[PDB]
Assembly symmetry: C2
Homo-oligomer: 61 residues x 2
Amino acid sequence: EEEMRKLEELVATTQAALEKEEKARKEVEALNAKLIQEKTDLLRNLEGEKGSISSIQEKAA
Amino acid sequence: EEEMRKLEELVATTQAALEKEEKARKEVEALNAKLIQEKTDLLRNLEGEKGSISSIQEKAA
């Protein structure tokens, strides 16, 4: 009466784990890669504008 | 015993699955924990500057 219950718990632990791995393996680079590109285009906009604010200071003196 | 042999192999993959499941999530929560504040205060940094750049040029012209 006990041989049936270990087989249904056997297939349940594998299908529940299998949907959990590839859900996590997808989102780790999905969040990281779109965050590292959006700082790179803003930083060259930043230091080029920080060079532009001193230009109005040297031209006025 | 052969019936306990079929039980223990896929659980060994599942115990290897759960440790890799928690490994991916705890590194992706800590990187988002400080970086979303990084994009907010630079927005005040840029707009507080470019609002002045629109204001410094009209009296310099």
